Amino acid sequence: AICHDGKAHFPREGVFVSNGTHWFVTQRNFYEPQIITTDNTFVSGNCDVVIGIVNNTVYDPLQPELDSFKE
């Protein structure tokens, strides 16, 4: 899973992988990394339960649009 803001994100359909520096989410039968966003994942619980969770940032697709909207 991924720790973003104190919440545990799990992939909707796929697995989290790391190429050494960055984290992506990809389907389980063909490597095509995708940026980890709220659409690829779903939240469940907090960071204190899962074993092996890792820190990372989860991009929010609505955030850039909201920023332009604010501007």
Partner: protein, 48 residues
């Protein structure tokens, strides 16, 4: 199950269990949150 189709691909057993749980229609967060209980139940069943 990968070794049943082609070259065996390593994967942590917890992740494999999440895959199986998703296969039986249960969200993998259930396992990732109850892993200790599932492991204890499996060990107890094997002992029995």
């Amino acid at each position: 199950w990968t070794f049943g189709a082609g070259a065996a691909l390593q994967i942590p057993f917890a992740m494999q269990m999440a895959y199986r749980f998703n296969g039986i229609g249960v969200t993998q967060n259930v396992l990732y949150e109850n892993q200790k209980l599932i492991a204890n139940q499996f060990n107890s069943a094997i002992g029995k």
